[PDB]
């Protein structure tokens, strides 16, 4: 399909969000890939990518994304448009909120990927984040632990934005 959505999940929350994002695009447009089962070369099959990853253990990548991270230097993302989303806990991990998507975007952009889908920091309370880019997040940030009532509307807004930014 046109968009490849590569997610990792420890406790299932990022996966659940990935299915909502898929359905908001239309199932016809997005193929889901759990990175526990992916090879880094699977990223080659798409010109439009969505990267999903929760932050774990106070600022670490989810472990399946950690595995792939180490091979991202073997892939060329030039010519691709890449968006990012994560789930995280702004209350419990205020100093590391959504660090994982920041870490992934730094790597993939240095490997040539162009980030699309920057997201306002309005409505979140946190101390620091590697996903911060001067007053915007590098992608959609969800918090199912503290703000689950806001997820659906956040996804609808973000996906509309991505359909425009991807030029669909
Ligand atoms: C031990 C532990 C550590 C966590 N560390 C972070 C963190 O550093 N930053 C963050 O934003 N969220 C942190 N979280 C919150 C998780 O990212 C959040 O629960 C997320 O929805 C999990 O997604 P998953 O179910 O897809 O694995 C942590 C949660 C646990 C239980």
User: After which residues does the chain have a break in its backbone, defined as C to next N over 2.5 Å?
Assistant: none
Q: Is the CB of 63 under 6 A from ligand 1?
A: no
Nearest to residue 72, comparing CAs of 49, 99, 89?
49
Ligand 1 centroid, distance to 17 Cα (angstroms) = 14
Mutate to test the pocket of ligand 1, among 17, 18, 36, 54 (most ligand atoms within 8 A of CB): 54
Nearest to residue 53, comparing CAs of 92, 13, 113, 22?
13
Q: Is the CB of 119 under 6 A from ligand 1?
A: no
Chain centroid to CA 78? 18
Q: Indicate the helix (H) or strand (E) that contains 49.
A: strand 48-52
Number of domains in the chain: 1
Evaluate whether 8 touches 63 at the Cβ level (below 8 Å).
yes
| Tokens found for residue 116 | 């699309």
The Cα 103–Cα 119 span in angstroms is 16
Q: Is the CB of 137 under 6 A from ligand 1?
A: no
Q: Is the CB of 9 under 6 A from ligand 1?
A: yes
Closest ligand 1 atom to Cα of 60: 8
Residue numbers of the domain that contains 61: 1-168
The Cα 161–Cα 54 span in angstroms is 21
Mutate to test the pocket of ligand 1, among 34, 89, 125 (most ligand atoms within 8 A of CB): 89
CATH code, 84: 3.40.50.360
Report resolution in angstroms: 1.1
Q: Is the CB of 10 under 6 A from ligand 1?
A: yes
| Tokens found for residue 55 | 């932050």
């Amino acid at each position: 399909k046109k968009i490849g959505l590569f997610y990792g999940t420890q406790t299932g929350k990022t996966e659940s969000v990935a299915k909502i994002i898929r359905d908001e695009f239309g199932n016809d447009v997005v193929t889901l890939h759990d990175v526990s089962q992916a090879e880094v070369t699977d990223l080659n099959d798409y010109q439009y990518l969505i990267i999903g990853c929760p932050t774990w253990n106070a600022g670490e990548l989810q472990s399946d994304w950690e595995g792939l991270y180490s091979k991202l230097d073997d892939v060329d993302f030039n010519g691709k448009l890449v968006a990012y989303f994560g789930t995280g806990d702004q209350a419990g991990y205020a100093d590391n909120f959504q660090d994982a998507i920041g870490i992934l975007e730094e790597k993939i952009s240095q490997r040539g990927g162009k980030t699309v889908g920057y997201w306002s920091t309005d409505g979140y309370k946190f101390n620091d984040s590697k996903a911060l880019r001067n007053g915007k997040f590098v992608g959609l940030v969800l918090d199912e632990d503290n703000q689950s009532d806001l997820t659906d509307d956040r996804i609808k807004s973000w996906v509309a934005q991505l359909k425009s930014e991807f030029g669909l």
